């Protein structure tokens, strides 16, 4: 169906312990495919998925240079933001950026992204128009002015509409056997008495890709949102994901509860019950 390429940039200052570390990781959907770490012994853009390995040395060299330049730019930027907030040189700070493109099933651009955060709080974001910015505060307004003066939104728009989607489509083709394969969840319901009055029904989804999934409990055909415990979807380490949903039910009322599962890899949504 729909696809994204996203890069996730994290830069972290560490006063008294050298210069800020910069790491960039790149994803197509839920699959990481590259990394760059300024703390590595020899920082290089490195493959993290098998399908990207076929790219020639030109790809790795070009991206490595971009990341090496970005390392210095983020260090310069961390200095600037420290000043924008009148902060001491003693404290550690974090600058994060996420950028990239989304395309539809036809591979056409749905939208682009370029968002930044400072110390875990929204700082500045490129609007969906790819032509204007939203600055969170007067510090970020300084950045906005610099970027407006220097045509940065135009650069982002050109990148997102061009390079980003072109590379995403290329990656999707090279890794089609995995990137364009949805693996359905393997599902089951477990049961454990809590007391004489209650028991937990836990609905499991294992081995699915991508991570997007809907796992719900209904009682008597009505969603049990407030009473359901949903764990965060978690990576298995084999590309796939895991999740469970649990509800506490009165003893003997188990068959009034149904677990519902929606996922892209399923030919049809599932309805499960505890099978004693």
């Amino acid at each position: 169906g729909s696809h994204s390429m996203r890069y996730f940039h994290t830069s972290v200052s560490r006063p008294g312990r050298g210069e800020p570390r910069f790491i960039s990781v790149g994803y197509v959907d839920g699959t990481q495919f590259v990394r760059f770490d300024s703390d590595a012994a020899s920082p290089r853009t490195e493959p993290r998925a098998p399908w990207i390995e076929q790219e020639g040395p030109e790809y790795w060299d070009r991206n490595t240079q971009i990341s090496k330049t970005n390392t210095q730019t983020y260090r310069e930027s961390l200095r600037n933001l420290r000043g924008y907030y009148n902060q001491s040189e003693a404290g550690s700070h974090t600058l994060q950026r996420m950028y990239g493109c989304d395309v539809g099933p036809d591979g056409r651009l749905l939208r682009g992204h370029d968002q930044s955060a400072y110390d875990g709080k929204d700082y500045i974001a490129l609007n969906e128009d790819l032509s204007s910015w939203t600055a969170a505060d007067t510090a970020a307004q300084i950045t906005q002015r610099k970027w407006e003066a220097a045509r940065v939104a135009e650069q982002l728009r050109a990148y997102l509409e061009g390079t980003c989607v072109e590379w995403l489509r290329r990656h999707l083709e090279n890794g089609k056997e995995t990137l364009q394969r949805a693996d359905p969840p393997k599902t089951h319901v477990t049961h454990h008495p809590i007391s004489d009055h209650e028991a937990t029904l836990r609905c499991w989804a294992l081995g699915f890709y991508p991570a997007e999934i809907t796992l719900t409990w209904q009682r008597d055909g009505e969603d049990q949102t407030q009473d359901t415990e949903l764990v965060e979807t978690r990576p298995a380490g084999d590309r796939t994901f895991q999740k469970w949903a649990a509800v506490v039910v009165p003893s003997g009322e188990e068959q009034r509860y149904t677990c519902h599962v929606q996922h892209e890899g399923l030919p049809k949504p599932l309805t499960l019950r505890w099978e004693p």
């Binding site: 890069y7 960039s24 790149g26 991206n63 971009i66 950028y99 610099k146 970027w147």
Partner: peptide, 8 residues
Amino acid sequence: DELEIKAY
């Protein structure tokens, strides 16, 4: 490819 970003 990634993008070469501008200073904040």
